[PDB]
Amino acid sequence: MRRVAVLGAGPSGLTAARYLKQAGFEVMVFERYHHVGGTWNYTDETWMSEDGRPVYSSMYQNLFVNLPKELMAFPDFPFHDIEGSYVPSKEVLKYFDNFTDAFDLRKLIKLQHHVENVRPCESGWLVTVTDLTTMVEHSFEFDAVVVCTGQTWCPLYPDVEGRSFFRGRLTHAHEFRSPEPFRNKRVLIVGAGPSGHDMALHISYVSKEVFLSRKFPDNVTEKPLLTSLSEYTAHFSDGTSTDVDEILYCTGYRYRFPFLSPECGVTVDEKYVYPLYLHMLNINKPTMLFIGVSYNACYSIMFDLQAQWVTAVLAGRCTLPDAETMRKEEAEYMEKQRAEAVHPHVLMNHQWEYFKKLEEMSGAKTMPPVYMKMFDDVASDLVKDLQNFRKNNYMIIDNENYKKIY
Amino acid sequence: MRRVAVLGAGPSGLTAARYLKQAGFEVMVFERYHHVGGTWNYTDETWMSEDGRPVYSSMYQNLFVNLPKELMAFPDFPFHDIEGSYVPSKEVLKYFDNFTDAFDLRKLIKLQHHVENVRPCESGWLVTVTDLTTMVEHSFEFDAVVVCTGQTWCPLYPDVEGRSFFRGRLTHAHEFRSPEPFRNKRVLIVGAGPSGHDMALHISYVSKEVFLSRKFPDNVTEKPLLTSLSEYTAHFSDGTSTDVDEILYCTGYRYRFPFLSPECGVTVDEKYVYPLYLHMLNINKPTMLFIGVSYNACYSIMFDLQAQWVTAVLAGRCTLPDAETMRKEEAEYMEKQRAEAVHPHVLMNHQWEYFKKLEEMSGAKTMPPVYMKMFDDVASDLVKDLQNFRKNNYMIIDNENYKKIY
Ligand SMILES: Cc1cc2nc3c(=O)[nH]c(=O)nc-3n(C[C@H](O)[C@H](O)[C@H](O)COP(=O)(O)OP(=O)(O)OC[C@H]3O[C@@H](n4cnc5c(N)ncnc54)[C@H](O)[C@@H]3O)c2cc1C
Ligand SMILES: Cc1cc2nc3c(=O)[nH]c(=O)nc-3n(C[C@H](O)[C@H](O)[C@H](O)COP(=O)(O)OP(=O)(O)OC[C@H]3O[C@@H](n4cnc5c(N)ncnc54)[C@H](O)[C@@H]3O)c2cc1C
Ligand SMILES: NC(=O)c1ccc[n+]([C@@H]2O[C@H](COP(=O)([O-])OP(=O)(O)OC[C@H]3O[C@@H](n4cnc5c(N)ncnc54)[C@H](OP(=O)(O)O)[C@@H]3O)[C@@H](O)[C@H]2O)c1
Numbered sequence A, B: 001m002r003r004v005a006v007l008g009a010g011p012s013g014l015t016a017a018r019y020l021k022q023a024g025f026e027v028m029v030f031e032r033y034h035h036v037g038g039t040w041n042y043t044d045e046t047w048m049s050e051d052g053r054p055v056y057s058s059m060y061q062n063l064f065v066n067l068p069k070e071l072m073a074f075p076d077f078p079f080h081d082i083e084g085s086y087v088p089s090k091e092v093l094k095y096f097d098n099f100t101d102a103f104d105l106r107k108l109i110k111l112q113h114h115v116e117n118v119r120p121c122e123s124g125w126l127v128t129v130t131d132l133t134t135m136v137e138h139s140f141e142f143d144a145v146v147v148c149t150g151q152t153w154c155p156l157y158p159d160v161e162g163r164s165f166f167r168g169r170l171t172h173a174h175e176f177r178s179p180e181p182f183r184n185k186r187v188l189i190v191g192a193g194p195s196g197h198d199m200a201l202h203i204s205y206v207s208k209e210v211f212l213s214r215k216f217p218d219n220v221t222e223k224p225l226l227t228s229l230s231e232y233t234a235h236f237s238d239g240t241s242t243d244v245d246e247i248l249y250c251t252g253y254r255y256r257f258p259f260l261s262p263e264c265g266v267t268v269d270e271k272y273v274y275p276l277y278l279h280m281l282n283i284n285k286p287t288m289l290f291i292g293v294s295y296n297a298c299y300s301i302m303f304d305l306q307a308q309w310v311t312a313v314l315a316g317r318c319t320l321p322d323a324e325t326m327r328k329e330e331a332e333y334m335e336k337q338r339a340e341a342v343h344p345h346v347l348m349n350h351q352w353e354y355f356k357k358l359e360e361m362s363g364a365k366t367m368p369p370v371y372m373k374m375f376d377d378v379a380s381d382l383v384k385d386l387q388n389f390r391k392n393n394y395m396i397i398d399n400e401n402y403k404k405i406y
């Protein structure tokens, strides 16, 4: 391998570019937006941009992180000085802009370039991209392709009996930018994950009555599963019903890679991408790898170790089994996800053991154990104390210990 | 049989009230809007009103009728004497306001009364409505109920592969009010019926790229069946693709009667309501009848005759076949609908025979043959000229003859 394409310049693509560059590859990064940083960029556009391509960002106004900045920084690139552990979103954008300049990656990135197609070409890959400033299509040959285009832009909707009859306004979390369209409305939020809880909190400030349906301020009434809709009325599994003007679906996202031609060898289902080894390596075409298909983890460690493992594979330095053994282990792993009732690429129940395995394979520096200890202490605080957890401040003391500040 | 509910005060319900009153019934008409005339009222509201119930009107700005006023009038109540046959929609709303006052029907109509539930008790009916001026619920007992609530408000959408991936704006003909939101957009209209054709025309004045997809002005490009969608691209049955910002579905409407309790004995599917005899009588509960479930016909004659047949049945002047025989005839008729590849309640192919049967059963006067002559002729005009047909003017000379003026 010498020439490697990275698709996307969010946190996955930037961290890939860092380590691929480190490794002496010739790297090119394609990014459709006009700034690096991925979903940490806020735009008022939703769905499709005036520039003729999709909007990939689901960031909204006045968002604060849900994990302390101490766990969001890479172990060897600390956060810039800012007061507070639970920073606004624009500080994490700044952190990735600073990362990009600290590791001299900006000269690698083609901004406002939208990847339209990726297909195998003999032993290599052919990537077709449009320069959105000129609308000209350009073509590029690579020995390897690392896909880092994210999974929080293509919405997933529940199927709800009677939805076609509802005559209020329907929206999804992707398009939420501020609570203003919900002012004085009766709002049903479906899905009580991070988006549902946070959006419920932001909407509770402007709206008449907010309902949160899951299978808070006075404002927010909890509901069980939504089981049908009629013209202006939502019906719950508990037999109760409430009239609503707006439904906001916070039911998450599906995987979607429109540029992958079928010849790339990957099947993309709503919550499953296969066949990948360790959520990264395309077993059918092993010079294509993905970063960021797994989720629900300590993301800074996940990006850093995935990018080093992908780099080690491409550099010929990783301890890999044969394709048959990778298919077998992928199967075993996905049987276990079904037994634990989690989706295929959810790392939460075994992330530390997974990260240890990526370190052993790739020769990455061992993670400071304080990341594990702090994450395990604080990560579910959004669930446990939604209204006040962001008031807490932390400081890392050394690679084993942290403290809570006041 | 004395007290009869009519649900809806559009053309159906007003012609029902005319004949039920003349037969000495005590008639109450419930209408949710603040004015009679049904779809012929234009409102800027779409979907749901600020009064808390649905918007049933799909009328849009600057609409001109697609049938000459001389065929839109009842044979015994002529149109007012304005110049021109293809009048703007306000002249038809005026026609029905004039009709309402001619037959002294206004005193029977409870305006701003939205029907919420209809159920049988014993051989009569309980009808529950909300007076939207006070938000008080009221119920009333009746010996018969005539359902005239229309079928152009609950939208029907095609199932198109990949539709959940499209990120442009989707709308339905129901909410079309003016071409303004389509200005300088690449618009795909799906469905080349009257809304399709007419919407396309209206939209072609504000965008130079309209595509009309079917199973014209310069900038309307014809496309064949839409077979799949992706993020911003429509793909058609000829294997061509076009990028689009907006899709407008002109695919029609579905039956929907939210107020019918299951005990009323009617099953309502998208394009089929059953079991009805001759599109009117509820065979399970035969003091419930429908007017205007049938469509695609010379509507003036259809509403006049259905209302006189309903009145005959309810007054004991028309004695019907037993239920077994009605079910057998309904099943033979529906088999012929399928053989002719039309929807269950579509009358176009046999309307004159159908109307003659209704005249015979109901005791109504025979229709002027001029209606049939003219209707079949404008139908010929339709086979021609979306841009030009409305320039024609007609005058009825007598019972059998008309003449056209260019
Ligand atoms: C509302 C919200 C709040 C969040 N809060 C937090 C938090 O507080 N803490 C936390 O740790 N994580 C949080 N996350 C998760 C976080 O955003 C993701 O973990 C992180 O952004 C994933 O990085 P990525 O590089 O994999 O994807 P992304 O950040 O989504 O980046 C993908 C990049 O690919 C580009 N792209 C996509 N398709 C193409 C194409 N065809 N051609 C060219 N470019 C392309 C996109 O423009 C984008 O720049 C949040 C996510 C959301 C939606
Ligand atoms: C855009 C458009 C253009 C048209 N152009 C033509 C044309 O040029 N010529 C032509 O002949 N026909 C045309 N038609 C068809 C015409 O509108 C209908 O044939 C006619 O209005 C049907 O009369 P109706 O009384 O059956 O239904 P509607 O006119 O739809 O009336 C039904 C009534 O029931 C009321 N209602 C519904 N639900 C409830 C409830 N729960 N409680 C209380 N009230 C309720 C509604 O408010 C409405 O007043 C057009 C239709 C549309 C949608
Ligand atoms: N910084 C912040 O404050 C913030 C704010 C918003 C979002 N985010 C981030 O955004 C990313 C995505 O979060 P998300 O909340 O949008 O997606 P998510 O984490 O995928 O949560 C979606 C939730 O909806 C549930 N669901 C699915 N079908 C449902 C139904 N019919 N009724 C009710 N619930 C249903 C899911 O339950 P099942 O899993 O059981 O199906 C899941 O709990 C995460 O990284 C999160 O951290 C962060």
Ligand SMILES: NC(=O)c1ccc[n+]([C@@H]2O[C@H](COP(=O)([O-])OP(=O)(O)OC[C@H]3O[C@@H](n4cnc5c(N)ncnc54)[C@H](OP(=O)(O)O)[C@@H]3O)[C@@H](O)[C@H]2O)c1
Pocket: B063, B064, B065, B066, B152, B158, B173, B190, B191, B192, B193, B194, B195, B196, B198, B213, B214, B215, B225, B226, B250, B251, B252, B253
């Ligand atoms: N100018 C006017 O005064 C005016 C304007 C608008 C509407 N109208 C009236 O409004 C009423 C409703 O009209 P409408 O046009 O909205 O509904 P409609 O008459 O039911 O027409 C719907 C059309 O959609 C087609 N269709 C369905 N699925 C399709 C798909 N997947 N792709 C392409 N086409 C598809 C139908 O063909 P199939 O039947 O083969 O499925 C039919 O041609 C009519 O009385 C009409 O005259 C009048």
Ligand SMILES: [Mg+2]
Pocket: A359, A360, A363, A364, A365, A366
């Ligand atoms: Mg090691």
